[PDB]
Protein backbone atom coordinates (compact mmCIF):
# COMPACT_ATOMS: atom_id res chain seq x y z
CA UNK A 1 0.00 0.00 0.00
CA UNK A 2 2.40 2.67 -1.23
CA UNK A 3 1.65 6.37 -1.39
CA UNK A 4 1.41 8.01 -4.81
CA UNK A 5 4.58 9.99 -4.14
CA UNK A 6 6.47 6.80 -3.25
CA UNK A 7 5.29 5.30 -6.54
CA UNK A 8 6.44 8.46 -8.33
CA UNK A 9 9.88 8.24 -6.72
CA UNK A 10 10.28 4.64 -7.85
CA UNK A 11 9.08 5.12 -11.42
CA UNK A 12 11.33 8.19 -11.73
CA UNK A 13 14.38 6.26 -10.51
CA UNK A 14 16.91 5.13 -13.12
CA UNK A 15 16.48 1.49 -12.09
CA UNK A 16 14.15 -0.82 -14.00
CA UNK A 17 13.65 -3.11 -11.00
CA UNK A 18 12.74 -0.13 -8.81
CA UNK A 19 10.37 0.94 -11.58
CA UNK A 20 8.86 -2.56 -11.58
CA UNK A 21 8.15 -2.56 -7.84
CA UNK A 22 6.64 0.93 -8.06
CA UNK A 23 4.49 -0.02 -11.07
CA UNK A 24 3.24 -3.08 -9.19
CA UNK A 25 2.44 -0.89 -6.18
CA UNK A 26 0.36 1.33 -8.48
CA UNK A 27 -1.44 -1.72 -9.87
CA UNK A 28 -2.37 -2.83 -6.35
CA UNK A 29 -3.72 0.64 -5.54
CA UNK A 30 -5.87 0.52 -8.68
CA UNK A 31 -7.17 -3.04 -8.17
CA UNK A 32 -7.71 -3.34 -4.39
CA UNK A 33 -9.23 -0.06 -3.19
CA UNK A 34 -13.00 0.28 -3.47
CA UNK A 35 -12.48 3.84 -4.78
CA UNK A 36 -9.07 3.75 -6.47
CA UNK A 37 -7.07 7.02 -6.73
CA UNK A 38 -7.19 7.13 -10.53
CA UNK A 39 -7.14 10.93 -10.75
CA UNK A 40 -4.18 11.23 -8.37
CA UNK A 41 -2.31 8.74 -10.56
CA UNK A 42 -3.15 10.73 -13.69
CA UNK A 43 -2.21 14.06 -12.11
CA UNK A 44 1.18 12.73 -11.00
CA UNK A 45 1.89 12.16 -14.70
CA UNK A 46 2.32 8.38 -14.54
CA UNK A 47 0.31 7.45 -17.66
CA UNK A 48 3.14 8.27 -20.13
CA UNK A 49 5.52 6.23 -17.98
CA UNK A 50 3.13 3.27 -17.88
CA UNK A 51 2.71 3.46 -21.66
CA UNK A 52 6.49 3.42 -22.12
CA UNK A 53 6.68 0.31 -19.93
CA UNK A 54 4.27 -1.49 -22.29
CA UNK A 55 7.12 -1.55 -24.81
CA UNK A 56 9.77 -3.13 -22.55
CA UNK A 57 9.71 -6.59 -24.09
CA UNK A 58 12.89 -7.43 -22.14
CA UNK A 59 10.91 -7.09 -18.86
CA UNK A 60 7.59 -8.88 -19.30
CA UNK A 61 6.68 -8.31 -15.60
CA UNK A 62 6.62 -4.51 -15.94
CA UNK A 63 4.65 -4.88 -19.18
CA UNK A 64 1.99 -6.81 -17.25
CA UNK A 65 1.88 -4.46 -14.25
CA UNK A 66 1.62 -1.38 -16.48
CA UNK A 67 -0.99 -3.05 -18.70
CA UNK A 68 -3.09 -3.93 -15.64
CA UNK A 69 -2.72 -0.43 -14.19
CA UNK A 70 -3.71 1.21 -17.49
CA UNK A 71 -6.62 -1.21 -17.89
CA UNK A 72 -8.11 -0.01 -14.60
CA UNK A 73 -7.52 3.67 -15.42
CA UNK A 74 -9.24 3.09 -18.77
CA UNK A 75 -12.24 1.49 -17.00
CA UNK A 76 -13.18 4.82 -15.38
CA UNK A 77 -14.77 8.00 -16.69
CA UNK A 78 -14.54 9.07 -20.32
CA UNK A 79 -11.99 11.67 -19.19
CA UNK A 80 -9.90 8.98 -17.49
CA UNK A 81 -10.14 6.75 -20.56
CA UNK A 82 -9.13 9.75 -22.67
CA UNK A 83 -6.01 10.22 -20.53
CA UNK A 84 -4.98 6.65 -21.39
CA UNK A 85 -5.64 7.20 -25.11
CA UNK A 86 -3.86 10.57 -24.98
CA UNK A 87 -0.74 8.86 -23.62
CA UNK A 88 -0.49 6.83 -26.83
CA UNK A 89 -1.76 3.63 -25.23
CA UNK A 90 -3.79 2.32 -28.19
CA UNK A 91 -0.91 1.35 -30.53
CA UNK A 92 1.13 0.06 -27.59
CA UNK A 93 -1.69 -2.26 -26.49
CA UNK A 94 -2.25 -3.50 -30.05
CA UNK A 95 1.45 -4.41 -30.20
CA UNK A 96 1.03 -6.38 -26.95
CA UNK A 97 -1.65 -8.54 -28.58
CA UNK A 98 1.25 -10.43 -30.19
CA UNK A 99 2.98 -11.12 -26.87
CA UNK A 100 4.00 -14.76 -26.24
CA UNK A 101 2.82 -14.37 -22.63
CA UNK A 102 -0.88 -15.23 -22.61
CA UNK A 103 -1.59 -13.21 -19.47
CA UNK A 104 -0.07 -10.09 -21.06
CA UNK A 105 -1.94 -10.51 -24.34
CA UNK A 106 -5.16 -10.99 -22.37
CA UNK A 107 -4.51 -7.78 -20.45
CA UNK A 108 -4.10 -5.85 -23.71
CA UNK A 109 -7.39 -7.32 -24.97
CA UNK A 110 -9.02 -6.17 -21.73
CA UNK A 111 -7.57 -2.67 -21.97
CA UNK A 112 -8.70 -2.25 -25.58
CA UNK A 113 -12.22 -3.33 -24.64
CA UNK A 114 -12.41 -0.55 -22.05
CA UNK A 115 -11.13 2.02 -24.55
CA UNK A 116 -13.54 0.88 -27.27
CA UNK A 117 -16.34 0.65 -24.71
CA UNK A 118 -16.10 4.41 -24.12
CA UNK A 119 -17.97 5.41 -27.27
CA UNK A 120 -18.17 5.41 -31.04
CA UNK A 121 -15.19 7.76 -31.44
CA UNK A 122 -12.70 5.66 -29.46
CA UNK A 123 -14.27 2.48 -30.83
CA UNK A 124 -13.49 3.64 -34.36
CA UNK A 125 -10.03 4.87 -33.36
CA UNK A 126 -9.15 1.44 -31.96
CA UNK A 127 -10.30 0.02 -35.30
CA UNK A 128 -8.25 2.54 -37.30
CA UNK A 129 -5.11 1.56 -35.37
CA UNK A 130 -5.62 -2.00 -36.67
CA UNK A 131 -6.83 -3.89 -33.61
CA UNK A 132 -9.27 -6.23 -35.37
CA UNK A 133 -6.75 -8.37 -37.28
CA UNK A 134 -4.61 -9.30 -34.24
CA UNK A 135 -7.71 -9.75 -32.06
CA UNK A 136 -9.36 -12.18 -34.48
CA UNK A 137 -6.04 -13.99 -34.95
CA UNK A 138 -6.08 -14.90 -31.24
CA UNK A 139 -9.22 -16.94 -31.99
CA UNK A 140 -7.95 -18.59 -35.21
CA UNK A 141 -7.77 -22.03 -33.61
CA UNK A 142 -9.57 -25.25 -34.68
CA UNK A 143 -11.44 -25.56 -31.36
CA UNK A 144 -12.21 -22.64 -29.05
CA UNK A 145 -12.37 -25.05 -26.10
CA UNK A 146 -8.56 -25.30 -26.11
CA UNK A 147 -8.29 -21.64 -25.05
CA UNK A 148 -8.39 -20.62 -21.40
CA UNK A 149 -11.93 -19.84 -20.27
CA UNK A 150 -11.12 -16.40 -18.86
CA UNK A 151 -9.02 -15.60 -21.92
CA UNK A 152 -11.85 -16.43 -24.33
CA UNK A 153 -14.44 -14.51 -22.28
CA UNK A 154 -12.34 -11.33 -22.35
CA UNK A 155 -11.89 -11.60 -26.12
CA UNK A 156 -15.63 -12.02 -26.69
CA UNK A 157 -16.45 -9.06 -24.44
CA UNK A 158 -13.93 -6.81 -26.19
CA UNK A 159 -15.26 -7.85 -29.60
CA UNK A 160 -18.81 -7.00 -28.51
CA UNK A 161 -17.64 -3.47 -27.65
CA UNK A 162 -16.30 -3.09 -31.20
CA UNK A 163 -19.86 -3.89 -32.35
CA UNK A 164 -21.39 -1.52 -29.79
CA UNK A 165 -22.86 1.99 -30.05
CA UNK A 166 -24.46 4.10 -32.79
CA UNK A 167 -24.22 7.63 -34.19
CA UNK A 168 -22.40 6.24 -36.03
CA UNK A 169 -22.65 2.47 -36.19
CA UNK A 170 -19.36 0.58 -36.57
CA UNK A 171 -17.83 0.70 -40.06
CA UNK A 172 -19.52 -1.76 -42.39
CA UNK A 173 -16.20 -3.35 -43.37
CA UNK A 174 -15.32 -3.85 -39.70
CA UNK A 175 -18.67 -5.56 -39.07
CA UNK A 176 -18.17 -7.90 -42.03
CA UNK A 177 -14.67 -8.70 -40.76
CA UNK A 178 -15.88 -9.58 -37.26
CA UNK A 179 -19.18 -11.36 -37.98
CA UNK A 180 -17.71 -14.78 -38.93
CA UNK A 181 -15.95 -15.00 -35.55
CA UNK A 182 -19.05 -13.78 -33.70
CA UNK A 183 -21.10 -16.52 -35.34
CA UNK A 184 -18.53 -19.11 -34.24
CA UNK A 185 -18.61 -17.75 -30.68
CA UNK A 186 -22.42 -17.89 -30.74
CA UNK A 187 -22.07 -21.70 -30.79
CA UNK A 188 -19.50 -22.01 -27.98
CA UNK A 189 -20.72 -23.81 -24.86
CA UNK A 190 -19.77 -21.24 -22.21
CA UNK A 191 -22.61 -19.16 -20.70
CA UNK A 192 -20.57 -15.94 -20.55
CA UNK A 193 -19.24 -16.21 -24.12
CA UNK A 194 -22.78 -16.90 -25.33
CA UNK A 195 -24.24 -13.93 -23.45
CA UNK A 196 -21.68 -11.44 -24.79
CA UNK A 197 -21.96 -12.96 -28.27
CA UNK A 198 -25.72 -12.38 -28.19
CA UNK A 199 -25.12 -8.82 -26.96
CA UNK A 200 -22.80 -8.19 -29.91
CA UNK A 201 -25.45 -9.48 -32.32
CA UNK A 202 -28.10 -7.33 -30.63
CA UNK A 203 -25.92 -4.25 -31.18
CA UNK A 204 -25.41 -5.07 -34.86
CA UNK A 205 -29.15 -5.56 -35.45
CA UNK A 206 -30.12 -2.28 -33.71
CA UNK A 207 -30.28 -0.21 -36.87
CA UNK A 208 -31.74 0.05 -40.37
CA UNK A 209 -32.73 -3.00 -42.37
CA UNK A 210 -29.43 -3.19 -44.27
CA UNK A 211 -27.61 -3.81 -40.98
CA UNK A 212 -30.17 -6.46 -39.99
CA UNK A 213 -29.68 -8.15 -43.36
CA UNK A 214 -25.93 -8.42 -42.74
CA UNK A 215 -26.69 -10.51 -39.65
CA UNK A 216 -29.65 -12.52 -40.95
CA UNK A 217 -27.69 -13.48 -44.07
CA UNK A 218 -25.16 -15.20 -41.79
CA UNK A 219 -27.92 -17.64 -40.81
CA UNK A 220 -27.77 -17.00 -37.05
CA UNK A 221 -31.53 -16.68 -36.47
CA UNK A 222 -32.11 -20.38 -35.61
CA UNK A 223 -29.26 -20.19 -33.08
CA UNK A 224 -30.70 -17.01 -31.53
CA UNK A 225 -34.06 -18.77 -31.18
CA UNK A 226 -32.31 -21.68 -29.48
CA UNK A 227 -30.62 -19.35 -26.99
CA UNK A 228 -34.00 -17.66 -26.60
CA UNK A 229 -35.04 -20.89 -24.85
CA UNK A 230 -31.97 -21.11 -22.62
CA UNK A 231 -32.37 -21.32 -18.85
CA UNK A 232 -29.73 -18.65 -18.12
CA UNK A 233 -31.37 -15.22 -17.93
CA UNK A 234 -28.10 -13.50 -19.01
CA UNK A 235 -28.44 -15.36 -22.33
CA UNK A 236 -32.20 -15.00 -22.92
CA UNK A 237 -32.06 -11.22 -22.43
CA UNK A 238 -29.64 -10.41 -25.30
CA UNK A 239 -31.07 -13.18 -27.50
CA UNK A 240 -34.56 -11.69 -27.13
CA UNK A 241 -33.22 -8.18 -27.78
CA UNK A 242 -31.59 -9.37 -31.01
CA UNK A 243 -34.75 -11.18 -32.14
CA UNK A 244 -36.82 -8.09 -31.34
CA UNK A 245 -34.43 -5.94 -33.38
CA UNK A 246 -34.67 -8.27 -36.38
CA UNK A 247 -38.48 -8.08 -36.49
CA UNK A 248 -38.32 -4.29 -36.79
CA UNK A 249 -37.03 -4.82 -40.33
CA UNK A 250 -38.90 -6.10 -43.38
CA UNK A 251 -41.66 -8.70 -43.42
CA UNK A 252 -39.20 -11.07 -45.10
CA UNK A 253 -36.72 -10.65 -42.24
CA UNK A 254 -39.51 -11.13 -39.70
CA UNK A 255 -40.44 -14.35 -41.51
CA UNK A 256 -37.02 -15.91 -40.87
CA UNK A 257 -37.68 -15.49 -37.14
CA UNK A 258 -41.07 -17.20 -37.51
CA UNK A 259 -39.61 -19.98 -39.67
CA UNK A 260 -36.95 -20.64 -37.01
CA UNK A 261 -39.61 -21.46 -34.40
CA UNK A 262 -39.51 -18.29 -32.28
CA UNK A 263 -43.26 -18.06 -31.65
CA UNK A 264 -43.28 -21.40 -29.82
CA UNK A 265 -41.14 -19.85 -27.06
CA UNK A 266 -43.35 -16.83 -26.40
CA UNK A 267 -45.82 -18.63 -24.09
CA UNK A 268 -43.02 -18.65 -21.51
CA UNK A 269 -41.56 -15.27 -22.49
CA UNK A 270 -44.95 -13.53 -22.26
CA UNK A 271 -45.38 -15.02 -18.76
CA UNK A 272 -41.72 -14.76 -17.75
CA UNK A 273 -41.30 -13.59 -14.13
CA UNK A 274 -38.63 -11.06 -15.15
CA UNK A 275 -40.46 -7.84 -16.00
CA UNK A 276 -37.95 -6.82 -18.68
CA UNK A 277 -38.28 -10.15 -20.52
CA UNK A 278 -42.08 -9.86 -20.55
CA UNK A 279 -41.88 -6.27 -21.80
CA UNK A 280 -39.38 -7.03 -24.57
CA UNK A 281 -41.28 -10.18 -25.57
CA UNK A 282 -44.46 -8.12 -25.94
CA UNK A 283 -42.58 -5.47 -27.93
CA UNK A 284 -41.38 -8.19 -30.30
CA UNK A 285 -44.97 -9.41 -30.66
CA UNK A 286 -46.15 -5.90 -31.52
CA UNK A 287 -43.76 -5.86 -34.49
CA UNK A 288 -44.93 -9.30 -35.65
CA UNK A 289 -48.62 -8.33 -35.58
CA UNK A 290 -47.68 -5.32 -37.74
CA UNK A 291 -46.57 -7.65 -40.56
CA UNK A 292 -48.55 -9.48 -43.20
CA UNK A 293 -51.86 -11.23 -42.61
CA UNK A 294 -50.30 -14.69 -42.97
CA UNK A 295 -47.87 -13.74 -40.20
CA UNK A 296 -50.77 -12.59 -38.03
CA UNK A 297 -52.22 -16.04 -38.70
CA UNK A 298 -49.10 -17.76 -37.34
CA UNK A 299 -49.49 -15.73 -34.14
CA UNK A 300 -53.08 -17.01 -33.94
CA UNK A 301 -52.07 -20.59 -34.77
CA UNK A 302 -49.40 -20.68 -32.05
CA UNK A 303 -52.08 -19.75 -29.50
CA UNK A 304 -50.50 -16.40 -28.62
CA UNK A 305 -53.60 -14.18 -28.71
CA UNK A 306 -54.78 -15.47 -25.29
CA UNK A 307 -51.31 -14.58 -23.99
CA UNK A 308 -51.68 -11.06 -25.37
CA UNK A 309 -55.06 -10.85 -23.62
CA UNK A 310 -53.30 -12.02 -20.46
CA UNK A 311 -50.57 -9.39 -20.59
CA UNK A 312 -53.18 -6.78 -21.52
CA UNK A 313 -55.14 -7.94 -18.46
CA UNK A 314 -52.29 -7.99 -15.92
CA UNK A 315 -48.64 -6.94 -16.21
CA UNK A 316 -46.33 -4.01 -15.59
CA UNK A 317 -47.81 -0.92 -17.23
CA UNK A 318 -44.88 -0.56 -19.63
CA UNK A 319 -45.62 -4.12 -20.76
CA UNK A 320 -49.35 -3.41 -21.09
CA UNK A 321 -48.46 -0.42 -23.27
CA UNK A 322 -46.52 -2.73 -25.60
CA UNK A 323 -49.47 -5.12 -25.65
CA UNK A 324 -51.81 -2.26 -26.58
CA UNK A 325 -49.54 -1.55 -29.56
CA UNK A 326 -49.61 -5.26 -30.41
CA UNK A 327 -53.42 -5.14 -30.55
CA UNK A 328 -53.59 -1.95 -32.62
CA UNK A 329 -51.20 -3.29 -35.26
CA UNK A 330 -53.13 -6.56 -35.15
CA UNK A 331 -56.47 -4.86 -35.88
CA UNK A 332 -55.05 -2.49 -38.52
CA UNK A 333 -53.59 -5.25 -40.69
CA UNK A 334 -55.76 -8.20 -39.74
CA UNK A 335 -58.63 -9.79 -41.62
CA UNK A 336 -62.22 -9.59 -40.40
CA UNK A 337 -62.02 -13.21 -39.24
CA UNK A 338 -58.79 -12.53 -37.34
CA UNK A 339 -60.35 -9.49 -35.65
CA UNK A 340 -63.48 -11.47 -34.74
CA UNK A 341 -61.30 -14.18 -33.20
CA UNK A 342 -59.48 -11.51 -31.19
CA UNK A 343 -62.80 -10.49 -29.63
CA UNK A 344 -63.77 -14.11 -28.95
CA UNK A 345 -60.56 -14.38 -26.89
CA UNK A 346 -61.72 -11.61 -24.54
CA UNK A 347 -59.74 -8.59 -25.73
CA UNK A 348 -62.46 -5.99 -25.14
CA UNK A 349 -62.74 -5.93 -21.35
CA UNK A 350 -59.00 -5.57 -20.60
CA UNK A 351 -58.82 -3.11 -23.50
CA UNK A 352 -61.50 -0.94 -21.87
CA UNK A 353 -60.01 -1.26 -18.37
CA UNK A 354 -56.84 0.39 -19.73
CA UNK A 355 -58.71 3.48 -20.97
CA UNK A 356 -58.31 4.96 -17.46
CA UNK A 357 -54.51 5.24 -17.31
CA UNK A 358 -52.46 8.40 -16.79
CA UNK A 359 -50.86 8.00 -20.25
CA UNK A 360 -52.22 9.85 -23.28
CA UNK A 361 -50.27 7.69 -25.74
CA UNK A 362 -51.93 4.42 -24.71
CA UNK A 363 -55.47 5.83 -24.80
CA UNK A 364 -54.92 6.89 -28.41
CA UNK A 365 -53.55 3.43 -29.25
CA UNK A 366 -56.56 1.79 -27.59
CA UNK A 367 -59.08 4.04 -29.34
CA UNK A 368 -57.62 3.28 -32.77
CA UNK A 369 -57.98 -0.43 -31.99
CA UNK A 370 -61.65 -0.03 -31.06
CA UNK A 371 -62.27 1.86 -34.30
CA UNK A 372 -60.60 -0.86 -36.38
CA UNK A 373 -62.61 -3.42 -34.39
CA UNK A 374 -65.87 -1.55 -35.04
CA UNK A 375 -64.86 -1.23 -38.70
CA UNK A 376 -64.69 -5.03 -38.90
CA UNK A 377 -68.13 -5.24 -37.28
CA UNK A 378 -69.63 -2.81 -39.81
CA UNK A 379 -68.34 -5.15 -42.54
CA UNK A 380 -70.22 -7.97 -40.76
CA UNK A 381 -73.36 -5.98 -39.92
CA UNK A 382 -73.24 -6.33 -36.14
CA UNK A 383 -71.89 -3.06 -34.77
CA UNK A 384 -74.77 -3.35 -32.30
CA UNK A 385 -73.82 -6.50 -30.39
CA UNK A 386 -70.28 -5.11 -30.09
CA UNK A 387 -71.56 -1.80 -28.70
CA UNK A 388 -73.31 -3.83 -25.99
CA UNK A 389 -70.10 -5.67 -25.11
CA UNK A 390 -68.32 -2.34 -24.66
CA UNK A 391 -71.33 -1.22 -22.61
CA UNK A 392 -71.58 -4.25 -20.32
CA UNK A 393 -67.90 -4.08 -19.30
CA UNK A 394 -68.04 -0.36 -18.53
CA UNK A 395 -66.33 0.68 -21.76
CA UNK A 396 -68.91 3.30 -22.70
CA UNK A 397 -68.50 5.15 -19.39
CA UNK A 398 -64.80 5.60 -20.17
CA UNK A 399 -65.19 6.63 -23.82
CA UNK A 400 -67.92 9.07 -22.79
CA UNK A 401 -65.58 10.52 -20.15
CA UNK A 402 -62.84 10.85 -22.80
CA UNK A 403 -64.78 13.31 -24.96
CA UNK A 404 -64.06 15.71 -22.07
CA UNK A 405 -60.31 15.13 -22.10
CA UNK A 406 -57.60 17.79 -22.37
CA UNK A 407 -55.75 16.45 -25.40
CA UNK A 408 -55.74 16.66 -29.19
CA UNK A 409 -56.94 13.34 -30.60
CA UNK A 410 -58.48 11.77 -27.48
CA UNK A 411 -61.86 13.51 -27.68
CA UNK A 412 -61.56 13.37 -31.48
CA UNK A 413 -61.81 9.58 -31.79
CA UNK A 414 -63.96 9.47 -28.65
CA UNK A 415 -66.68 11.72 -30.09
CA UNK A 416 -66.43 9.77 -33.34
CA UNK A 417 -67.11 6.38 -31.72
CA UNK A 418 -69.86 7.64 -29.40
CA UNK A 419 -71.94 9.30 -32.13
CA UNK A 420 -71.39 6.54 -34.73
CA UNK A 421 -72.07 3.43 -32.60
CA UNK A 422 -73.63 4.71 -29.34
Amino acid sequence: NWSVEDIVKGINSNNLESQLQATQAARKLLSREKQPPIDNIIRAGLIPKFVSFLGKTDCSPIQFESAWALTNIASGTSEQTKAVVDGGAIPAFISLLASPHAHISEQAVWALGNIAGDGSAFRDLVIKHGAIDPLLALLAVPDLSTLACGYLRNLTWTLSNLCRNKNPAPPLDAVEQILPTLVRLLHHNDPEVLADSCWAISYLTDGPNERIEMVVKKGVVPQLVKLLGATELPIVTPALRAIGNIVTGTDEQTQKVIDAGALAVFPSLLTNPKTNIQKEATWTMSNITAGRQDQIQQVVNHGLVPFLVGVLSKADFKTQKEAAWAITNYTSGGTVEQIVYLVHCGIIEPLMNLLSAKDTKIIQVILDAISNIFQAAEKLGETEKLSIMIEECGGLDKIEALQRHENESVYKASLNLIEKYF
Binding site: W68, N72, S75, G76
Partner: peptide, 6 residues
Amino acid sequence: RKRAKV
Protein backbone atom coordinates in the same frame (compact mmCIF):
# COMPACT_ATOMS: atom_id res chain seq x y z
CA ARG B 1 -19.23 -1.12 -21.29
CA LYS B 2 -16.15 -1.00 -19.05
CA ARG B 3 -14.64 -3.49 -16.61
CA ALA B 4 -11.96 -3.03 -13.96
CA LYS B 5 -9.63 -5.87 -13.00
CA VAL B 6 -10.03 -6.16 -9.23
